[PDB]
Design a protein around this ligand. Structure first.
Ligand SMILES: Nc1nc2c(ncn2[C@@H]2O[C@H](COP(=O)(O)OP(=O)(O)OP(=O)(O)O)[C@@H](O)[C@H]2O)c(=O)[nH]1
Ligand SMILES: COc1cc2c(c(OC)c1OC)-c1ccc(SC)c(=O)cc1[C@H](NC(C)=O)CC2
Ligand SMILES: Nc1nc2c(ncn2[C@@H]2O[C@H](COP(=O)(O)OP(=O)(O)O)[C@@H](O)[C@H]2O)c(=O)[nH]1
Ligand SMILES: [Cl-]
Ligand SMILES: [Mg+2]
Ligand SMILES: [Mg+2]
Ligand SMILES: [Mg+2]
Ligand SMILES: [Mg+2]
Ligand SMILES: [Mg+2]
Ligand SMILES: [Mg+2]
Ligand SMILES: [Mg+2]
Lengths: 340, 439, 422, 54
């Protein structure tokens, strides 16, 4: 009988893992402040990594990489991409963002802005923190100044028909204790059922790509798919019929590349090869796709929720490859293995 | 020549003391009886090795050392063992009944009766020093004598020897070693009382020493003799600069100058390599590149923590054996790009390097192997704070219920001293936060 | 912390005490004449903890035999190791105690107590450094219950900074002699709460159940019960008696096992249960089992504050640590999470007589309240109707002293429950 | 990366290699606090021997 502890009450992914571990008849739950465990399903903020791997006899695992917040915080992501000698300059897939604070990039933001205002290439920028949009620099800076980033807004997204509507692609990545990167073959597109506007420089409905924020602001929740979530069998078929390409070629090679480059960069800082405690983590990469079928990274989510129907398969994948790899019990791989 | 007196308090201090002075004797070519054939200056000479050894007219080389314990059986092994002729009887001091793993008992009750005796025997050694530097205090955080009496001694040494240096070699408690249940109290009570009075403190987590003996030497269950012989190599690598001729770490004040910018933040992380098994009788000799690489692996550290999640204030490399500057510079440049060595913004991101061509000696028939080059990295990193956080959490759990407090109150200590000492550790944890992050 | 002075009071205390000296003399290689004829030296290393050295390499126990009637102490002298004891350490009265706490504590025992203390002082003066005292006695009778607790109080007055250890045998209706044992026990438990550092609760109910169920004896004598006690007493004193890697005296045991002053009533255990070879997993499984506990209390109904294991015999230290951590980590609900690292283990190479290896358990469990509740109910059943009080009030006591002792033991039960729910 | 102040001898050598540039109690109180513990022990012993005399 193995032992684990739950320190995140509202983790829909790891509450399901907790229930699936109990289904084996070989794991059992302790109270959260009991140190005598094999597996920590830790809290999302201020997880005590310093106190892990010191209890004698117990091989201790945890579901978060320490310092993976480097990738997942929006401001730290921009600092990482720019300062890294493995990504900056060479990289193109990231929209070149700038950090603002209430050292700072007051100096750097206005360098690129001016030559865009001269030429025909548009000058729209989106503001966000670790939800405002404007063409002018004045209308963004007010709420900002009392971790904040200004990213290049994609004015030329790929459109879904019928309707000329916008989407963002969510793909789940599981990095295990050996740092084997596993991409879940079923992804999801958080679409927007309201058509995309262009000349309107103030509206923020279709412009926002979420599932939850698309619930309140829009009554039309889509009859062509349900809810605002499109899956890999349908989107592949749409691309083949409309654009004459598969999901693999046009988009998925770029996703697997961006996942590699981001995770391989932080590897020597976060990895637990020769460490007193092991660790895995589930990441949720968010992507955009422009009208030339180039994929752009938006945000890496360090503690992501899954889609409703995919909870059963994915959480079983988590316990198979991440947990049971370290703690064996007594396929059809549901993941694609990216190297490293 | 400037002398160095080495004080040994409690069981851990004495038994580690035995390992160190056994080793020192083999490194300098001093025999058990005290004769040193290499030494041509009889009854003096003020060589580099004379910083640790005084001389008599008969040609005996006597450790500048004082062994103290509140019970006799541990120091009786010194009196009966192979190096009995090394020490004069006045150096070895023993009480009747011990501190029973109680700081309050070792500090207040029993310590008070023996403190004036111990300072008198230290004064006997100090009176025969032409130019004394300071002290090297060996003890445990967990032991009643090692926690209680040491902190009393460290207070009295600040009065009686005000300007002198005070270095600590502290054994941090580990439940594999079988400690007492109240060692988290003893560790925090003694750290509070000693913090103002110690200049530089080399913590040694028994967990790390135990697991290094398990992992590298392939020992099923490491004894204290296994732990102490490994620990004495690190102590030897640290103290080597005082005992041998060179031009780095050559005086005890340089450790303070180099490694300790903030006076309270005086706990450097020791990292030693290579640790090799004697069963591997022919092993493939590790290069300067490899052993310097091993100094950034958590497995080889003295305290288990992650330097990657923290910031270096100082970093200092002490090589022993077949090494030259070109090899170290090549190793540092290779390691520079590979590892994530984050330094603080307000310090120069450099490495102070020292080489002593005499390679690391080992005890004949020991579990350690004789190698041709080794390194000890002393590095003041904020990741050491993890060790305080673990220990402060164990304190809080018991102290929330007043568990075991009556034993300390029964010896004259107050409940105020627990919360006083804890708030200083809370302040110390906050000091490592301020230094170790950008915000 | 070197020498220990043994005392044995009453019928039970002397019979158990005599068996304890049989066992440890055999382990230390001391024959009935007091001469050392042994093979190893891992026997003489800490022999002076329990023995004095007379001339001619004679090893005489540091033991004091006490009783209010001479019958039981004459039987000890006639027994197998009766030669070994000092003749002037036999302190005995003629009247007897009549299974009355009041007679042992106040009237009959008060005459004899000065003669005991003279022998205690004579033994303590010759000690290089006295650890403290250990007492063997029952709480159901008169002498061992009443005079033993009087001795404890008087010894504390004269030696207030020394450790006071006890092996207290609790009464049970299954092995009861008199109906007034709950009175005698309740009065003594109140004394033990104040004036002892460490008490080993040896319940006769448990000893009977261990003999009846398992072992499988339809008719157990006191000899059968005492076989388990002498085995347990050997086990718990192993770290005091031999040079185990663990540094070991009575004060250190008290410092680590006693988180709060009043809660020092331990629950001993043993494995294997004896009257042919056993592995480390099987030892570790047995010692924690309720059927191997010498106090009749289910440890699953409470929580362990502190635990102390002593494995004996030549076995793998790695396999011990794995199995102890196996039991500990995977039954972690029954240990308190607010005392980290509260289970410790010691290993001694020399096994007990006639076993290759064994394991002794010492536990400060909150489930010990079940024992004190059982006596409290037996007490209160009689006390509510003032039944059998004329025996005690005839010796000068009154009802208020009984009322206090009842309240004090119910506070002790309430205090164990306080820390069980934390 | 550059090496500064290299020193040498027959026993060994040493140097610094920079990589990036930068940007109490008294004896009275001790013996006071020790004797305060002694008095609290003597107070706790006094209340015991008082209580034992009762
Ligand atoms: N490395 C090492 N650690 C030791 C040794 N002896 C004891 N320890 C550790 O030190 C702590 C116990 O301290 P001791 O030195 O035995 O106790 P003490 O200072 O003599 O104090 P008292 O025994 O109460 O007088 C435990 O955490 C042990 O793990 C040793 O020889 N080597
Ligand atoms: C008298 O012999 C004993 C000595 C000790 C102990 C002891 O009991 C095993 C002993 O009884 C067998 C001892 C007991 C129990 C605990 S559990 C809280 C404990 O933490 C610490 C000890 C101490 N040290 C170790 C390593 O276990 C004190 C020493
Ligand atoms: N285990 C054990 N219990 C005993 C023995 N003799 C008496 N008892 C118990 O102790 C109680 C009576 O105490 P006893 O020692 O006879 O009276 P005392 O001589 O006046 O102290 C009863 O509850 C008995 O069950 C014995 O040899 N072994
Ligand atoms: Cl001075
Ligand atoms: Mg000691
Ligand atoms: Mg000389
Ligand atoms: Mg100072
Ligand atoms: Mg005292
Ligand atoms: Mg009379
Ligand atoms: Mg008299
Ligand atoms: Mg009877």
């Amino acid at each position: 009988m193995y032992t684990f502890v739950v320190r995140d009450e509202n983790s829909s992914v790891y509450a399901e893992v907790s229930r699936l571990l109990l289904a084996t008849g070989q794991w059992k739950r302790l109270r959260k402040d009991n140190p005598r465990f094999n597996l920590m399903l830790g809290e999302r903020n201020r997880l005590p990594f310093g106190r892990l791997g010191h209890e004698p006899g117990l091989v201790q695992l945890v579901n978060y990489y320490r310092g993976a917040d480097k990738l997942c915080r929006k401001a730290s992501l921009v600092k990482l991409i720019k300062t890294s000698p493995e990504l900056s300059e060479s990289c193109t897939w990231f929209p070149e963002s700038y950090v603002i604070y209430p050292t700072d990039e007051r100096e750097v933001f206005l360098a690129a802005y001016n030559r865009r205002r001269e030429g025909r290439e548009g000058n729209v920028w989106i503001a966000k923190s670790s939800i405002l949009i404007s063409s002018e620099a004045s209308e963004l800076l007010d709420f900002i100044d009392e971790v904040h980033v200004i990213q290049k807004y994609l004015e030329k997204p790929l459109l879904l028909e019928p309707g000329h509507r916008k989407f963002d692609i969510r793909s789940w990545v599981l990095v295990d204790h050996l740092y084997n990167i596993y991409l879940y073959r079923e992804g999801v597109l958080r679409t927007s059922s309201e058509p995309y506007n262009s000349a309107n420089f103030q509206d923020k409905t279709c412009h926002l790509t979420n599932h939850c924020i698309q619930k309140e602001y829009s009554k039309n929740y889509g009859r062509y798919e349900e809810g605002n979530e499109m899956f890999f069998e349908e989107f592949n078929q749409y691309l083949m019929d409309a654009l004459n390409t598969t999901l693999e070629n046009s988009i998925l090679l770029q996703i697997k590349h961006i996942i590699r480059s981001c995770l391989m960069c932080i590897e020597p800082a976060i990895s637990t090869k020769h460490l007193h405690y092991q660790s895995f983590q589930l990441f949720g990469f968010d992507f955009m796709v422009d009208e030339e079928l180039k994929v752009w990274l938006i945000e890496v989510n360090g503690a992501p929720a899954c889609a409703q129907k995919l909870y059963a398969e994915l959480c079983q994948g988590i316990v198979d490859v991440a947990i049971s790899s370290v703690f064996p019990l007594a396929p059809t791989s549901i993941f694609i293995k990216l190297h490293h | 020549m400037r002398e160095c007196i080495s004080i040994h308090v409690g069981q851990a201090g004495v038994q580690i003391g035995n390992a160190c002075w056994e080793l020192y004797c083999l490194e300098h070519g001093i025999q058990p009886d005290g004769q040193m054939p290499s030494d041509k200056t009889i009854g003096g000479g003020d060589d580099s090795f004379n910083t640790f050894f005084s001389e008599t007219g008969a040609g005996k080389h006597v450790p500048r050392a004082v062994f103290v314990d509140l019970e006799p059986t541990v120091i009786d092994e010194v009196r009966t063992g192979t190096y009995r002729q090394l020490f004069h009887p006045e150096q070895l001091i023993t009480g009747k009944e011990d501190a029973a793993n109680n700081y309050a008992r070792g500090h207040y009750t029993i310590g008070k009766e023996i403190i004036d005796l111990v300072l008198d025997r230290i004064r006997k050694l100090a009176d025969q020093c032409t130019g004394l530097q300071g002290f090297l205090v060996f003890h445990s955080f967990g032991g009643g004598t090692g926690s209680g009496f040491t902190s009393l001694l460290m207070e009295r040494l600040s009065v009686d020897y005000g300007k002198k240096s005070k270095l600590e070699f502290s054994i941090y408690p580990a439940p594999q070693v079988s400690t007492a249940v109240v060692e988290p109290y003893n560790s925090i009570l003694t750290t509070h009382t000693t913090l103002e009075h110690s200049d530089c403190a080399f913590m040694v987590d028994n967990e790390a020493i135990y697991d290094i003996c398990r992992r590298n030497l392939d020992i099923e269950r490491p004894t204290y003799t296994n732990l102490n012989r490994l620990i004495s190599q690190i102590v030897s690598s640290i103290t080597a600069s005082l005992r041998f001729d060179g031009a780095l770490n050559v005086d005890l004040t340089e450790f303070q100058t180099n490694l300790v910018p903030y006076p309270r933040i005086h706990f450097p992380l020791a990292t030693y390599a290579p640790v090799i098994s004697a069963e591997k009788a022919y092993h493939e000799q590790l290069s300067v590149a490899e052993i310097t690489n091993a100094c950034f692996e958590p497995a080889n550290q003295m305290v288990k923590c992650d330097p990657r999640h923290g910031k270096y204030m100082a970093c200092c490399l002490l090589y022993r054996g077949d090494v030259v500057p070109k090899d170290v510079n090549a190793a540092i440049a290779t390691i520079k790009t590979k590892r994530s060595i984050q330094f603080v913004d307000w310090c120069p991101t450099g490495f102070k390097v020292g080489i002593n061509y005499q390679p690391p000696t080992v005890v004949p028939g020991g579990d350690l192997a004789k190698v041709q080059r080794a390194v000890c990295m002393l590095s003041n990193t904020t990741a050491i704070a993890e060790a305080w956080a673990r220990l402060d959490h164990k304190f809080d759990l018991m102290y929330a219920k007043r568990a075991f407090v009556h034993w300390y109150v029964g010896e004259g200590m107050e409940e105020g001293e627990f919360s006083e000492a804890r708030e200083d550790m809370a302040a110390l944890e906050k000091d490592y936060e301020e230094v170790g992050v950008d915000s | 912390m070197r020498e220990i002075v043994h005392i044995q009071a009453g019928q039970c205390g002397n019979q158990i005490g005599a068996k304890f000296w049989e066992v440890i003399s055999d382990e230390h290689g001391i024959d009935p004449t007091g001469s050392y004829h042994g093979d190893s030296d891992l026997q003489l290393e800490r022999i002076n903890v329990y023995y004095n050295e007379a001339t001619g390499n004679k090893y005489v126990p540091r033991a004091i035999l006490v009783d209010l009637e001479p019958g039981t102490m004459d039987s000890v002298r006639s027994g197998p190791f009766g030669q070994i004891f000092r003749p002037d350490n036999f302190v005995f009265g003629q009247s007897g105690a009549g299974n009355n706490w009041a007679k042992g504590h106040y009237t009959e025992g008060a005459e004899l107590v000065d003669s005991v203390l003279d022998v205690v002082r004579k033994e303590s003066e010759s000690c290089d450094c006295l650890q403290g005292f250990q007492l063997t006695h029952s709480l159901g009778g008169g002498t061992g219950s009443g005079m033993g607790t009087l001795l404890i109080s008087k010894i504390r007055e004269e030696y207030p900074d020394r450790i006071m250890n006890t092996f207290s045998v609790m009464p049970s209706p299954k092995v009861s002699d008199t109906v007034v044992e709950p009175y005698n026990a309740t009065l003594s438990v109140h004394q033990l709460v104040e004036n002892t550092d460490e008490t080993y609760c040896i319940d006769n109910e448990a000893l009977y159940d261990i003999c009846f169920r398992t072992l499988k004896l339809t008719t157990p004598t006191y000899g059968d019960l005492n076989h388990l006690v002498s085995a347990t007493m050997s086990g718990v004193t192993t770290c005091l008696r031999f040079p185990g890697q663990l540094n070991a005296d009575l004060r250190k045991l008290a410092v680590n096992m006693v988180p709060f002053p009043r809660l020092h009533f331990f629950m001993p255990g043993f494995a294997p249960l004896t009257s042919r070879a056993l592995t480390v997993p099987e030892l570790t499984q047995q010692m924690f089992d309720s059927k191997n506990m010498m106090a009749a209390c289910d440890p699953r109904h409470g929580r362990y504050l502190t635990v102390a294991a002593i494995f004996r015999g030549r076995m793998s230290m790695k396999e011990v640590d794995e199995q102890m951590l196996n039991v500990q980590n995977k039954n972690s609900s029954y240990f308190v999470e607010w005392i980290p690292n509260n289970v410790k283990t010691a290993v001694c190479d020399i096994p007990p007589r006639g076993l290759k290896m064994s394991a002794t358990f010492i536990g400060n469990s909150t489930a010990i309240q079940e024992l004190f509740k059982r006596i409290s109910e037996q007490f209160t059943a009689m006390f509510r109707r003032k039944a059998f009080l004329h025996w005690y009030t005839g010796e000068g006591m009154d009802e208020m002293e009984f009322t206090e002792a009842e309240s004090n033991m119910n506070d002790l039960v309430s205090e164990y429950q306080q820390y069980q729910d934390a | 990366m550059e090496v500064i102040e290299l020193n040498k001898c027959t026993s060994g050598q040493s140097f610094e290699v920079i990589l990036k540039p930068p940007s109490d109690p008294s004896l009275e109180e001790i013996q006071k606090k020790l004797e305060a513990a002694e008095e609290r022990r003597k107070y706790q012993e006094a209340e015991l021997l008082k209580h034992l005399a009762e």
